[PDB]
Amino acid sequence: GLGTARLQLVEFSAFVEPQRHLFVHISQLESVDVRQIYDKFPEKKGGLRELYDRGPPHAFFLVKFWADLNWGFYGVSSQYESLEHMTLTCSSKVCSFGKQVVEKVETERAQLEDGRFVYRLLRSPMCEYLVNFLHKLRQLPERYMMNSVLENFTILQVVTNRDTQELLLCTAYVFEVSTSERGAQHHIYRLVR
């Protein structure tokens, strides 16, 4: 799954409510060469290339989403777990044409539950950049046109141990829109080099 010995992603949804509509949903491996995606993120250099250099490599994952854009409050919910008690820092960086346009930093302390520690970042309001972007994208008359536009938009999430600043998970997200009949889908890849 998306995870290491220390921390695993358990759930990730992005949605809109008035029952909710999920754009993408992961509820919990082939590899991809990270060089194939260097150009979709800033040379911040805090961005992808720099992080990967400093490792470790097994903490780095690529998720490819086929979103359901076929549908208020817009939210993002994430849930992780581990066997160690930590405080997590979760940074989410939205990029457009290789430049960072949003950075969102949240922290979450472990919550003991059924024998392990869960970290629940539930119903964060989606950044308005993205809410506005989705409403425009929703205007396009053809799915192929939405995919042209989305080729340029990516998200980079970095989850570190807040007290030690050790990187625990780094996840690159890329996006296409699914057809009106095929639901949402995702595939998770290990990033290697």
From Swiss-Prot:
Coiled coil: none annotated. It comes from the Eukaryota. Signal peptide: none annotated. It is found in: Nucleus. Residues 1-193 are annotated as: Transcriptional activation. Transcription factor which plays a key role in the Hippo signaling pathway, a pathway involved in organ size control and tumor suppression by restricting proliferation and promoting apoptosis. The core of this pathway is composed of a kinase cascade wherein MST1/MST2, in complex with its regulatory protein SAV1, phosphorylates and activates LATS1/2 in complex with its regulatory protein MOB1, which in turn phosphorylates and inactivates YAP1 oncoprotein and WWTR1/TAZ. Interacts with YAP1 and WWTR1/TAZ. This is Transcriptional enhancer factor TEF-4. It comes from Homo sapiens. The gene is TEAD2. The chain holds residues 222 to 446 of 447 of the full protein.
